[PDB]
């Protein structure tokens, strides 16, 4: 039944989202870390019955139907924003502003 294989995808998406949140919380002290954010997408819809005639001097609601397919994790973006600066007084520490990476 499609309900089971849809709710399975829902549970998988929720589990991956929880894993992403846990990973973000784990490295709350890692220096120069950019947080993750997971975005999903609904799968393509499956049409069964096309809608019929409408506005035919009547106020009926549309008749077509289309079942969903589920949700999939489509992407995971890292927020490349600017973090705070912690003072370590060590002569060999560098904090970089704006945008840039050391090769």
């Amino acid at each position: 039944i499609s309900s089971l294989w849809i709710a399975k995808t829902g549970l998988d998406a929720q589990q991956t989202n929880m894993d992403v949140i846990a990973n973000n919380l784990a490295n709350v002290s890692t220096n120069g870390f950019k947080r993750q954010r997971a975005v999903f997408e609904d799968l393509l819809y499956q049409t069964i019955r096309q809608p019929g005639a409408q506005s035919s001097e009547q106020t009926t609601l549309p008749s077509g139907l289309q079942i969903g397919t589920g949700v999939r994790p489509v992407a995971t973006e890292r927020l490349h924003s600017q973090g705070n600066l912690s003072q370590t007084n060590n002569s060999k520490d560098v904090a970089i502003k704006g945008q840039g990476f050391f090769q």
Binding site: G10, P51, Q66
Partner: protein
């Protein structure tokens, strides 16, 4: 003897409605998602005698365009629309569709796009400078600032195209991008025209409009209805089996 067919049809349509509800519940966190309304529809069989058998076929109206809730992410290029605003993007087939997923992204070559599909504005898809920082105005203006350049050189480099659909005349396509119905597009043109009465908000993102209370109520009702139909099925089957012995001697 044919009431078994009506009961099994009702059970199958209940399963379809349950599948629709499960689909709505599964993607409850995708940005800019619209729920899928559903309501059972009656179809009466009739002719020449005692019209009693009325079958049930499930049906799904367009959607409920109740705006989703907004969460603040402070990202410069996150857009949240008005009560019934839409962003128009060209689809895979080349036609245009409407959406509310405000998670805009910029490619390596200055190509703005929602997930998968590029965004269109004045003319074709809008393009920004190669690495310019982007700010979105309250009316759709895309201001660009080249990195390193002093701030006094922020320049508008395009404009989003925003349409206004009330909701009763848009139908979800096969890839989740809404489009105008046949009569609506006939009476308003194939391509809609941009309007200024629509304002966006930068930094906030829109979720989905799925009602947990509605989902739970529908699940309970579907469970009870399906069980009742199954009981009718077994009662009719037992009755027919017991009555089948009349032909014997």
């Amino acid at each position: 003897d044919h009431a078994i067919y009506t009961a099994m049809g009702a059970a199958s349509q209940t399963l379809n409605q349950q599948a629709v509800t499960a689909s709505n519940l599964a993607n409850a966190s995708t940005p800019g998602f619209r729920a899928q309304l559903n309501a059972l529809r009656a179809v009466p069989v009739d002719g020449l005698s005692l019209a009693t058998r009325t079958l049930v076929t499930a049906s799904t109206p367009g959607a409920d365009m109740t705006p989703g809730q907004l969460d603040y992410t402070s990202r410069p290029l996150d857009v949240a629309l008005q009560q019934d605003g839409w962003l128009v993007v060209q689809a895979a087939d080349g036609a245009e569709g409407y959406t509310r997923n405000g998670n805009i992204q910029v490619g390596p070559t200055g190509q703005l796009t929602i997930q998968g599909h590029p965004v269109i504005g004045e003319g074709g898809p809008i393009t920004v400078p190669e690495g310019s920082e982007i700010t979105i105005a309250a009316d759709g203006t895309i201001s660009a600032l080249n990195p390193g350049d002093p701030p006094n050189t922020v320049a508008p480099v395009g404009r989003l195209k925003l349409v206004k659909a009330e909701g009763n005349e848009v139908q979800r396509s096969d890839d989740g991008l809404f489009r105008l119905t046949a009569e609506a597009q006939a009476e308003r043109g194939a391509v809609l025209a941009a309007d200024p009465s629509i304002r966006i908000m930068s930094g906030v993102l829109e979720g989905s409009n799925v009602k947990p209370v509605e989902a739970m109520t529908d699940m309970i009702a579907n469970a009870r209805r399906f069980e009742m139909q199954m009981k009718v099925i077994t009662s009719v089957d037992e009755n027919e089996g017991r009555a089948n012995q009349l032909l014997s001697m």
